Amino acid sequence: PDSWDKDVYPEPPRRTPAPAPQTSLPNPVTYLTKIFDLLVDRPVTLAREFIEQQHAKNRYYYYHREFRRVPDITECEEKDILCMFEAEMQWRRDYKVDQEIVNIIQERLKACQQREGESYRQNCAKELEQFTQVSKAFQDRYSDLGAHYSARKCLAKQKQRMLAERKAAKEAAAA
Amino acid sequence: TMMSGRPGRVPLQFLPNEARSLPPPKLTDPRLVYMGFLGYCSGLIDNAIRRRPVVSAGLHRQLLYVTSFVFFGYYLLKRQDYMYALRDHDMFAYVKSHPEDFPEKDKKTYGEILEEFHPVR
Amino acid sequence: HVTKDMFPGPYPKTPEERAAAAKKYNMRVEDYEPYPDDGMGYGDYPKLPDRSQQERDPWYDWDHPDLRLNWGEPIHWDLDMYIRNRVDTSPTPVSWNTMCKHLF
Amino acid sequence: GSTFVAYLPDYRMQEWARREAERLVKYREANGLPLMESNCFDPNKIQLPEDED
Amino acid sequence: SSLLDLIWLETILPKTTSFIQMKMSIMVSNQKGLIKLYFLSFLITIMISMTLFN
Amino acid sequence: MLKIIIPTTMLLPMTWMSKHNMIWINATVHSLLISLISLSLLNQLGENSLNFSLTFFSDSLSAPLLVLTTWLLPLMLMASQSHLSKETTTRKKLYITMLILLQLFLIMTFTATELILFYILFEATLVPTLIIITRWGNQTERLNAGLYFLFYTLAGSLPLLVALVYIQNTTGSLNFLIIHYWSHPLSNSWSNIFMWLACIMAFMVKMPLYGLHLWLPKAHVEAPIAGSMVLAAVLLKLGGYGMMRITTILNPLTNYMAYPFLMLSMWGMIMTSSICLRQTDLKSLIAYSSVSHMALVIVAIMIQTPWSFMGATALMIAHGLTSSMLFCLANTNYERVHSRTMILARGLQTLLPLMATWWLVASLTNLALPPSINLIGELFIITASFSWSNITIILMGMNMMITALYSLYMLITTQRGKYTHHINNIKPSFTRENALMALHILPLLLLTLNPKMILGPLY
Amino acid sequence: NVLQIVRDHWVHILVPVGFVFGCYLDRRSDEKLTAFRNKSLLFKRELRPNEEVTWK
Amino acid sequence: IRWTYARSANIYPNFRPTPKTSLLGALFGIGPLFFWYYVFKTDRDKKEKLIQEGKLDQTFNISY
Amino acid sequence: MNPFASLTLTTLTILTIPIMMSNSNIYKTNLYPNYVKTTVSYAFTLSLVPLLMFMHTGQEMIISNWHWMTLQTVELSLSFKMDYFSVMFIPVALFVTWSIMEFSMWYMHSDPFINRFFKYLLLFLITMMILVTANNLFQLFIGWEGVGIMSFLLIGWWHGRTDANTAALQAILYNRIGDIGFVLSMAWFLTHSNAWDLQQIFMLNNECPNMPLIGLLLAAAGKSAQFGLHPWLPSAMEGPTPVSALLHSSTMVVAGVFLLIRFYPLMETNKLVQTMTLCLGAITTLFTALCAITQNDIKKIVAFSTSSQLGLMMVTIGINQPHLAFLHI
Ligand SMILES: CCCCCCCCCCCCCCCCCC(=O)OC[C@H](COP(=O)([O-])OCC(O)COP(=O)([O-])OC[C@@H](COC(=O)CCCCCCCCCCCCCCCCC)OC(=O)CCCCCCCCCCCCCCCCC)OC(=O)CCCCCCCCCCCCCCCCC
Ligand SMILES: CCCCCCCCCCCCCCCCC[C@@H](O)O[C@H](CO[C@H](O)CCCCCCCCCCCCCCC)COP(=O)(O)OCC[N+](C)(C)C
Ligand SMILES: CCCCCCCC/C=C\CCCCCCCC(=O)O[C@H](COC(=O)CCCCCCC/C=C/CCCCCCCC)COP(=O)(O)OCCN
């Protein structure tokens, strides 16, 4: 269905083997499914076509809102409140975006697990690795900020992380 | 602050002439309407005390209370605004005449300011 | 309709007020026994037997058949603890210590 | 009032965040970028304090 | 209910404050109305102020 | 925001100029209209807030509380309509005026851009409820209950004024936006410790914290039905709202100053729940259950994590609705028996079956049955505490267990068994009471369908 | 009957009048804080040919 | 009426500070609080030490 | 397309129609029990088809239809799992319930509130279906609490009897003791695996630690009336015979064993928890059989027989044979 992008939500070909009856006994499954189509799937499709043509009679559009990039907290003065406000709003929007990214990865992982069945432990290694990477990135970015999270606290956390990394690298090089 | 000893102050002036250079308060000022409401409440209490119909005992007396409260409130607002203008004028004059006590702080960016981070756990 | 003087009061110290409290609580003077005079504020109220409400006579025509109480009789301090829906102290065919030893 | 609350416009920007996230993951997967980045702000813009200890 | 809520938690904050305030009020207000003691205390506090805050 | 305040103020001249036999009708109609208007505030943004003016603003945390406060007044009027039948018209108008003033003060309290204005209105709310409790109270202990309720709060809140003026003198402003944006860490100093205590105690005494909760059972037992309603639904949430707003400036001291309080709640939410098992008064039982729930909310606020905050907001809303419903039920029983004791009226399901259904639904909501918002808040706070420390669950679990017990106790003692023989003045339930219970319960199950409206700004 | 029911039902007009008056007060406040209209860095937009203000 | 009044409002006027009541109140009101405080302080200190040492394996711990 | 999903959801959808009609006029007549029984029979004969489809091919599906809410990185949605266990347990449960309601139309003929009794039976059936088909821990907890509260309501059917009330409260007490462990497991899973959806829990836990499985075992012991928490099941005989026959003998009780079956991939990676499960099952079955040996009331004897069977099923769970335990269910 064109309602969603296929690349964002990748799916396997899932080829299905053709029926190969071995005995002469007619399986009731096929009779039940045929009567199911005849009694359910036809009126439903008819009503959907009617509704779709009614919608086609009156078409109107809605658009995705675009946001312009604004200077962030690292290029903000100490007590300048306006640019601080803009940086805080931009940081919050970015935060929501990363939360939705993690949501997409988690949905991918769950779908892989259910689809591959009892071979999931070997057939979903790639999704598990992607989820591990995204989870590590998100935990590094936004964990332990607190209930009153803000851009300055995230910046301070990132700065102390760079301090730790720089000290460790200097010590290893000078070891 | 103690602006009692401010030089060039007339001993008993409610409003000096230099107070006429400021924008007068509007008649629809919320403070004036509040003063009128206080006058109306005073009239209602007066009617209640004398054991009279509270809402409609004397319309003339309630009108007099409202008008007197509005008059005095307008004058009080003028005086208060003038006093605050004087305070700000003295503030700015002093900071202008004493640059050594109010140095310009070097504007520093957050990207070069190290703030300690306390994790919440 | 309740006056000030029939409400529970302080621990009785003289036999006169002891008999007065027994009369207030609708029980015999010889049967009346207040709680000990310690810090806990039991006070005037009588120390009724710790028997549960379940083991009361099921054939007596009580005024409250479900709770098996009579109107006007003194009420146990812990009545809500024994209401036949909670802990009961009815005798059991085997002694308590034997049952505990066997299960343990 | 219940109907009014049910059909409130998405002022919280849920679908906007969904669509932005979809475009970002599509771009980063097409060009090979490693999905989310560990650093929220680029290190080129932070002036770190030299220790010289 | 009885020991903690009805006895000790009531003893600590409310009852202690009430007892202290009642006792202090009794001590402060219990004067016979004699100007003799009043002016004696006036003299004492005058000398205390003279000898203590300078 | 003035579109809500101005009609509430106009409620007073309407009430005072109404006919001698039409005050209730107009009061209820226009209170419901004001609630409908205030429903618009639920539309919130993931961004900062809806900053109406320099004096008022709204947030995703203030919106549910404002909607609940506006919805409460019609219910309080319907509850108070019964027992004020033999009252003079002037005194009924005074009572309605007190209710309207209390609602107005709460409405301007929950917006409160600036902390000193918040304190002014949050202390102004003390007067109408005190007058309600000490004037239209049945018992002779109403005076002592009013004194306790007044003095606990005033003793708690007096150092808060000093702390707030000190904050304004040092930092320079008390506007919440500037306070959040210019927030700075608190150094580990004795001065800062006493600063923290002054800023926190005023709100923690009104939650109420365990050990500071002596005033609540009294103020609940001696108050009339409207007083119990308002003090159980919204006036308890003033402390939680205050702590949620004020904790932005207390970091990182709160990381270790919260230990004495957490314990007091973590143990307290157990102890009071056990108190509920042995109670001879319905009102006292519900008051102690309220203390337990608010102790859990205190734990959630002191943990200071996002899930904790959303759980605390949801629990505040759900507890307010359920407690008001339970107190309405208890008052309906009292107006028939005039005794306010649990063991006198028994077997009421045989006599009043729909009231028995209302009792069952109220108990199930208080029992935190899924998927009600009560359980949503309870579970969120439990998970956040589990992340705080894996051992907490033990206490939490115990409380949950005990909770269910006493709830069903309250359901079984009053409604099941054999009816008491000598009570024969049990008239069939009126339409007014049944409508009150329906208007209490339907919003809970409706909010269950859209939890995001009551999960706070951190959703 | 008009001029008879009015003396009893004029009081129902007060609250809706308060609401509309309330709306006007909110609008008055909005005009004052127009110091940054079409001046925020995020929403800096060139006006339409027949536009004077971004919002009112 | 007597039972309810004795259960509710006749406790404090008949309450006298005694060594038994004082000791029981101190125990039952202070012991549990400090005991739970010690337990939780030890647990959280151990967790903080493990976090600082880096040996905790907090992977996938996103919601807190 | 794919009638599996449509029929599987249609069974649960039509199981709820008489609940909506409970305010209609049919609820005030004597035809309501027959109406509910016919609805249950139709639901069973409709549900017989997806089981046939699975038998032919092995069809399994997850249906995440309604999105309840999203909490940062967690997403809670209305998801139904229709794997082998669900599509096999639904027809058996519906058949048993149909037989029980047909029997109750005779057993409870003299009860003035018979329509309320059938309404309660249908509500319990709906909550059990919700529990069985649940895909995330929140929906499963919803069903877990629904079956328990419906058991409380049905045991105390004669509210004028003190023993019925105390038995119902006892059942609530023991089930809440199990709920402690259930909530511990939910908190652990959302804290560590960052999801309540079963697929993520299965992916992220290759070597499940002791604590979540301990919580699950405690919940299963509480609801299945194991040795530590057994007396509630025999005391739950204060209720009517039809209620005991369906709720306490063959359906609600097996909830704990079913929960342990649902999480069998994680159970097989823990060796201590399996040992505890086996030991608890063995003590439960022997203690209950020993009790049933000398009992004199027939209902109590069959209750102890059911408890012994549940203990045997837990023993099967302990030795890592989940499908055999489901077959025994
Ligand atoms: C942000 C705040 C917003 C609002 C501000 C709040 C205050 C507002 C009002 C302030 C005071 C002004 C009026 C008070 C005068 C007192 C008179 C009185 O008692 O009432 C009788 C009178 C009616 O009775 P009556 O038939 O004439 O004769 C009866 C006798 O008078 C007397 O009858 P009686 O003697 O037979 O009965 C005795 C009774 C009567 O005794 C009393 O009622 C005394 C009055 C209360 C004392 C007020 C003291 C001063 C005000 C303090 C305000 C504090 C605010 C801070 C919050 C804390 C609250 C304590 O006393 C008792 O029952 C004793 C029991 C004690 C109970 C507890 C006491 C609590 C009192 C605290 C009240 C505070 C608020 C008052 C609200 C208004 C009350 C009228 O009431 C009125 O008519 C006045 C009400 C307002 C009139 C509205 C007209 C406007 C409508 C048309 C224009 C539309 C406007 C919009 C414009 C656009 C439209 C086109
Ligand atoms: C009694 C006998 C039975 C008769 C009834 C039989 C029929 C059964 C139907 C009853 C419930 C069955 C469940 C069916 C649910 C369908 C409706 C639901 O899906 O809508 C919800 C909508 O419900 C509302 O969100 C919740 C109601 C609002 C709650 C406010 C309460 C009213 C105000 C009163 C004062 C409040 C006081 C407390 C302070 C807050 C959630 O929808 P959502 O997925 O999201 O999006 C809607 C569609 N969009 C995408 C176009 C927007
Ligand atoms: C239920 C009743 C509860 C009542 C409230 C209990 C909490 C009491 C809070 C403490 C009282 C004083 C608060 C002061 C307001 C905060 C302002 C502040 O913190 O500024 C400090 C000032 O701090 C103080 O001065 C506080 C001193 C305390 C004096 C009053 C003592 C009151 C009793 C204290 C012990 C009880 C507190 C906890 C009680 C718990 C509730 C029972 C720094 O001032 P500087 O001198 O300029 O800085 C020094 C560097 N140049």
What percent of residues of chain B adopt helix (DSSP H or I)?
40-55%
Structural class of the secondary elements of chain B? mainly alpha
Distance between the termini of chain B: 47 Å
Head-to-tail CA distance between termini of chain F? 23 Å
Bin the strand percentage of chain F: under 5%
* Helix-strand pattern of chain F: HHHHHHHHHHHHHHHHHHHH
- As a percent range, the share of helical residues of chain F equals 55-70%
Counting DSSP H or I runs of 4 or more residues, the number of helices of chain B is 2
Largest sheet of chain B: none
Q: What global shape of chain F is seen?
A: globular
What coarse outline of chain B follows from CA principal-axis ratios?
flat
Oligomeric form: part of a larger assembly
Q: Could you characterize what this model shows?
A:
- The structure is cut from a larger assembly and holds nine protein chains of eight kinds.
- Chain A is flat, with a radius of gyration of 27 Å.
- Chain A starts with 27 loop residues before the first helix and ends with a helix.
- Chain A is built from five helices and no strands.
- Chain A is an all-alpha fold and 175 residues long.
- The relative contact order of chain A is 0.07.
- In chain A, helix 2 runs antiparallel to helix 4.
- Chain B has one domain.
- In chain B, 7% of the residues are buried.
- Chain F is mostly helical and 459 residues long.
- Helix content of chain F is 69%, strand content 0%.
- Chain F has 20 helices and no strands.
- Chain F is globular and about 65 Å long.
- The interface between F and G is medium-sized, with 23 and 16 residues.
- The site of 1,2-dioleoyl-sn-glycero-3-phosphoethanolamine has 14 residues of chain F, from helix 7 and helix 9.
Outline of this structure?
The PDB classes it as electron transport. Keywords: mammalian, mitochondrial. The structure is cut from a larger assembly and holds 9 protein chains of 8 kinds. With 54 residues, chain E is mainly alpha-helical.
Which key terms come to mind for this protein?
part of a larger assembly; 9 chains; B: 121 residues; mainly alpha; 49% helix; E: 54 residues; 81% helix; binds cardiolipin; binds ligand PLX; binds 1,2-dioleoyl-sn-glycero-3-phosphoethanolamine; electron transport (chain G); respiratory chain (chain G)
What is this structure's SSE topology?
This is part of a larger assembly, with nine protein chains of eight kinds.
Chain A: H1 28-56, H2 81-116, H3 120-123, H4 125-142, H5 151-173
Chain B: H1 30-49, H2 59-97
Chain C: H1 15-24, H2 96-103
The structure holds cardiolipin, the ligand CCCCCCCCCCCCCCCCC[C@@H](O)O[C@H](CO[C@H](O)CCCCCCCCCCCCCCC)COP(=O)(O)OCC[N+](C)(C)C and 1,2-dioleoyl-sn-glycero-3-phosphoethanolamine.
